[PDB]
């Protein structure tokens, strides 16, 4: 039953190419619902889910205003951070930002996050209490000293505890058909002959929501972790996800192997065998 809302911000500096890039995206569980792109002609917070289009002019005016505000802050951080590690005005650099909250099956508050990175290495993040900070290096000890005084955490804390959960809860009951669903994987198994003696068995999980899933192979009941080719879970493009796992097996021995499938929408985890 448990849920969550996350926002992602990315800024790649464009030196000798003008205004920095800025992409803002927003999510409920694994369904994206809003975005802002700097180079897009709109200059407005746009709907990416059909259940968010239901909101009025005051909501879009509200999210537009606040989003331009996030953008301009990032425009400044890039130079501040450039002014610490001794970076040239020449090269490009990236700032990343995640914040959001999580809830349970009762929809009541679980936890909040605010993370920050510079150039793919972690930089500064709210500790799990929402009252303190983790500084990844010496440079973000200055950022920490700075934010600690100006009670930045306490603002971030009140949103993440209250306003965040309340908006998440309106969204879940507006996208009841979309967000409050769990689609069991459609599972099946293929057999390809590598040689006259070896054969590939691929175990498939298709059309599931949300993205979380475990696929494993066993032989006679002993896990084949070392011998399993596993792919990263992947979007289908229609709101659902896909995944597979494969083992290379000797011909005749196909009955020794079983595929095991765990999902949020399967009442009993499945055990698949080749005929």
């Amino acid at each position: 039953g448990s849920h969550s809302m996350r926002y992602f911000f990315t800024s790649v500096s464009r030196p000798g190419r003008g205004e920095p890039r800025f992409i803002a995206v927003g999510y409920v569980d694994d369904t994206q619902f809003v975005r802002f792109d700097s180079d897009a002609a709109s200059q407005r917070m746009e709907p990416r889910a059909p259940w968010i289009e239901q909101e009025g002019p005051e909501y879009w005016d509200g999210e537009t205003r606040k989003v331009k505000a996030h953008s301009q802050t990032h425009r400044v951080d890039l130079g501040t951070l450039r002014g610490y590690y001794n970076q040239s005005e020449a090269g490009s650099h990236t700032v990343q930002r995640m914040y959001g909250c999580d809830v349970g099956s009762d929809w009541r508050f679980l936890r909040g996050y605010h993370q920050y990175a510079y150039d793919g290495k972690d930089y500064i993040a709210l500790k799990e209490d929402l009252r303190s900070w983790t500084a990844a290096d010496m440079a973000a000890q200055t950022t920490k000293h700075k934010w600690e005084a100006a009670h930045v955490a306490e603002q971030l804390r009140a949103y993440l505890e209250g306003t965040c959960v309340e908006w998440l809860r309106r969204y879940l009951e507006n996208g009841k058909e979309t967000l409050q669903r769990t689609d069991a994987p459609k599972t099946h198994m293929t057999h390809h002959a590598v040689s006259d003696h070896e054969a590939t068995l691929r175990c498939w999980a298709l059309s599931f929501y949300p993205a979380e899933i475990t696929l494993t192979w066993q032989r006679d009941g002993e896990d084949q972790t070392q011998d399993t080719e596993l792919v990263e879970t992947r979007p289908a493009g229609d709101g659902t996800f896909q995944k597979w796992a494969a083992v290379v097996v000797p011909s005749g021995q196909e009955q020794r192997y079983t595929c095991h499938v765990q999902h949020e929408g399967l009442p009993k985890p499945l055990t698949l065998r080749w005929e």
């Binding site: 927003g26 989003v67 802050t73 400044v76 603002q155 971030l156 306003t163």
Partner: peptide, 9 residues
Amino acid sequence: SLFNTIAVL
């Protein structure tokens, strides 16, 4: 719904 007054780094 985004957070409002966001602090600079």
